[PDB]
Point group: C3
Chain length 350, copies 3
């Protein structure tokens, strides 16, 4: 009944994960929406959610890593987008999809960055011209200009229903967006149609396969859930990435201590005095630093169950952390001022 | 055919749009589920939501203008209720119905102010006594007083089940809440029945016509994904009016500049410093001055994609704005102190 | 019949509510799906939500009172758990179950503190080992330590599938987690099963009867309407217990007065200057003093519609309040220093 249970070995997380999830989904599709328990082969210690969280961080890291070539980063927008060229990776997309779902069912928030269109497509919708704004700003401006051109296309701008599709070392791939997209020039009359097709390409046709497998994954989990009724894509984004809540009161509550600290410690009582006087940008930095993100789960920061463990006597070492357990490793410094200097330099340098 | 597309001309908005949306119902009524694209006739410009937003603003403005007689404004609650008298308007209601629908699939929040009962009736519920508290303060007090009277009603009040519905000229038309209200005095025992019948008429019967229309319209652009998963009337009010989130950081992000401003600029930085140090009260006056409201869209303020453009050298002119584009025309003043002075006076003067 | 309507006399709330609800349940049970209208006998006075609120406070208070012995309190977590030995109380559990349900539709929050496991069980999900962590902190640690032990369970912890269950005055109750738990020693191979079964019994089998009644009561008010499909139980908790918003601006708007105090009054304006400064730790206390909790309903503090009534001329008493209506009886002090000094002592003394 309850209990999902995934046993995967680091080194093969993705393969192992996938394989198990495909069987479970085959046996009881519902088991995919239950309380997740991850276990790394050969490593003991009950998963209180921290393991499952590391499981998520790890999968997310491999997938968006350029190495595997599944997504492309936009230095500009700071968002990934499927790489149309990803080949023989149906399984990984199926997995990153499953994981996004599992992440929604366990109050776990991933640090993923897709353009609104990825969620919009996950809502069964087609990417359109307006959607081009976030995914491909550059391209969108051109189509915008072309659209808003006052002169006479054709004789001015000589373009057809053919478009380029390069690969790493150039080599465009003159794709026809329409039957004979060679001799059908773009006119102040085609442009409208040209743009909507150029847009349907890029956002949809261009990336099916990769995206088809991606949704299949998200759907093995989100099938039959309040997701079918969500309105805007931001709602799915909130479910996956978290809100921008900022309690800290509540975060202070539910904050446990290990290594001999306890709620009453000059170092702890000082920590909070400091943290609360923090500016929000600083509070969000601390969060990134101690957790995988700067956002909050469903219920707020208090649901993060942070742990401030001692990490040596006074020193100069910067406080470190384990973002999968939300554990702040804090060396018991001699002064509030030192704690403050050392904490700020630690989270701003991250 | 991406987009819904509404080609309408100012100086004939409500009609035209009603005529298109209607016809869009006479054919593949699916389109209503798509992404709205408004186009004012004559005017050339790609709708990136700014034209659409204006469509909404202008519409909402007329529909609630006393002139068109569809709604009445409660000077005190600053809310609007349906007008039992507006007949021959059973299409203009079906219109805001659509507009409210559309506004939910667009993260464009409206400037609609309905007493909770409207949303309650939309979720499919009957209006009751308690609802009068906001929709009819004064009426509610009278009925609350009737029920709470400690003396002997009948031996103290000359009222029966025949209540009046009065003109705009002082002419009353008797209306019987029950079989033969003329006789049949209200007693300490009927008063409840009386209050319940007087409330049912006024919140349900008296405006069945205009509401049903409003319901249909809302129903035309959202069907199937009802307010299922929305348990409180308040949840629907947010979808249409935004939350009271006030992120600002994030609003600072996503903010673009124009006319030579850029993220770096003494003025632009003095602005943020100022805006950030703004009391929440002020912060709300500014969203209202720059956007059509003090509320926030799904996803926080950052989704406003606000724009701040330079508007000539240090003047005395107070800044200005095009709410439908979230653009803040800011004169390149000669000082951070002058910016704050002119800005505040401008946001408080609107 | 607009409302549910529970006419009950104090001194007999649990009993009267139960009888009336048992009648409403028999006759058109529909009433169970209408907004609650409470009437304390012999106390004429429209229930504007105030009465309902008091009714909840009294019911929750009585039901979670150590006297009736239905729930047990954990002083570490400050949470309540079902008492497995709460024998002839099947009707009370239903009542408190019916309350939580109404809470879901009332923008009035119940200050009920349950381990997240309760709300998962309400969604028809069985509790799990991880779930204990909150309901049974110490038992959990044991089982965890049991599972993490690197030694040799048997010749180290000598234990079996027979656990010990006590009653008010010691005297365990050797419950067999398995067939003849007597002679099946827990080993490094059993413990997983031992721990599952132990976690199962406790959260599920152990409270079966009492929780079944509880769930039923909840179910009576929340039929079909998903709540069963929500992604996270915390979503059910929020609806019932409120979030942690702290608008105050907004709480200042919507705030009404009585007994002379008009929106404008040096004493009134002096009030907002004090509160608006304050610390959001004091602001949490103040909120706890005037209303039940420091949490806000759907929408924010503004929804609380707090009332500031003048409680006689300048005295030396501490301002007082009726939490059921979020009413702060404020004596018209001789300055804000009095005001500010009196209030601060009140909220930190009540």
């Amino acid at each position: 009944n309850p209990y999902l249970r995934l046993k995967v070995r680091r080194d093969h997380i993705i393969d192992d994960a996938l394989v198990r999830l495909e069987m479970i989904a085959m046996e009881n599709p519902a088991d995919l929406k239950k309380q997740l328990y991850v276990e790394f082969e050969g490593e003991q210690g009950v998963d209180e959610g921290g393991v499952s969280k590391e499981f998520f961080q790890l999968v997310v890291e491999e997938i968006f890593n350029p190495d595997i070539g599944m997504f492309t980063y936009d230095e500009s927008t700071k968002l990934f987008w499927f790489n149309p060229s990803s080949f023989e990776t149906e399984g990984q997309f199926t997995l990153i999809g499953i994981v996004l779902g599992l992440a929604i069912y366990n109050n776990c928030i991933l640090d993923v960055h897709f353009p609104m269109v990825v969620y919009r497509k996950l809502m069964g919708k087609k990417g359109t011209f307006r959607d081009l704004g976030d995914s491909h700003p550059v391209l969108y401006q051109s189509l915008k200009d072309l659209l808003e051109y006052e002169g006479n296309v054709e004789d001015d701008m000589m373009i057809t229903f053919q478009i380029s599709q390069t690969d790493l070392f150039g080599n465009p791939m003159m794709y026809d967006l329409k039957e004979n997209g060679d001799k059908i020039p773009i006119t102040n009359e085609n442009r409208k149609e040209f743009v909507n097709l150029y847009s349907d390409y890029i956002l949809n046709k261009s990336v099916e396969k990769q995206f088809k497998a991606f949704r299949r994954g998200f759907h093995m989990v989100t099938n039959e859930s309040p997701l079918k009724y969500l309105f805007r894509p931001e709602e799915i984004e909130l479910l996956i990435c978290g809100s921008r809540n900022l309690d800290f009161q509540a975060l202070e509550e539910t904050t446990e201590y290990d290594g001999g600290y306890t709620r009453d410690s000059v170092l702890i009582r000082e920590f909070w005095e400091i943290v609360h006087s923090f500016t929000d940008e600083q509070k969000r930095l601390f969060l990134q630093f101690t957790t995988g993100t700067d956002r909050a789960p469903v219920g707020g920061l208090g649901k993060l169950k942070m742990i401030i463990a001692k990490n040596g006597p006074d020193t100069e070492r910067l406080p470190t952390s384990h973002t999968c357990f939300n554990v702040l490793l804090l060396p018991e410094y001699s002064s509030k001022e030192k704690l403050k200097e050392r904490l700020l330099k630690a989270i701003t340098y991250a």
